[PDB]
Amino acid sequence: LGEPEPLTEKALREASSAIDVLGETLVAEAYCKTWSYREDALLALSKKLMEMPVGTPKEDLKNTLRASVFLVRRAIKDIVTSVFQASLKLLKMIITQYIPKHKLSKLETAHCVERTIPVLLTRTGDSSARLRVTAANFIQEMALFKEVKSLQIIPSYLVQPLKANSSVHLAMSQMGLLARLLKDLGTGSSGFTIDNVMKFSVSALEHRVYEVRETAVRIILDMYRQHQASILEYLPPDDSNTRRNILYKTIFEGFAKIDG
């Protein structure tokens, strides 16, 4: 049980503000090469956050939240599973317990979500299937927490178009999350719209990976079962020249199958 190594010059400037709020010891623990210290820092921070009394000044509560979110964000990228899992436990406590306990605003909730969800989505492209599932399940869990659901933030990340050079795992995970949360949250108040969903799905039909294109077809057909006529403007016209692309054939005779 030797002490954590010192922070590098780069880490020092990067974590400058967190050091003032949380102290150098805890930040050094979080940055060091010993996973059990990285884990302990997050669990210690978890204890510290919930022991802060109700009447604590709002600016101290917000600073502490912002410094903690800074550490959660880096720990979501951890190379050891236990540290990754401890960061999710901390993140959940901040959004679901700390914020409502101290009656903090929607801007704080939004800050937690905006700083962590994009980094968490990168972990849904991990090589480990068990890690992809843990990351995806947590995103689904946060998307349905009452305070986060109201902000409509998470659906907006899930409809962002798939990059050309995107991995097979990353693309499949995003599509899986889109389909599952679209069914749970629906259209209107959620942040999903016929507009952004179809825009995403039609764009995915040009992806290099067969399985990505195939899932886009499945989502388009599901949107036709629900919304019928209002999605047709997003697609090309139904005729035999369009049907010389094999995917659009499947879609349009798919539409024909769904009707009489």
Author numbering: 414 to 673
Give the exact sentences the study uses for this entry:
Cep104 is a key factor involved in cilia formation and length regulation that rides on the ends of elongating and shrinking cilia. It is mutated in Joubert syndrome, a genetically heterogeneous ciliopathy. Here we provide structural and biochemical data that Cep104 contains a tubulin-binding TOG (tumor overexpressed gene) domain and a novel C2HC zinc finger array. We have structurally characterized two of these domains, a central tubulin-binding TOG (tumor overexpressed gene) domain and a C-terminal domain consisting of an array of four Zn fingers (ZNF domain).
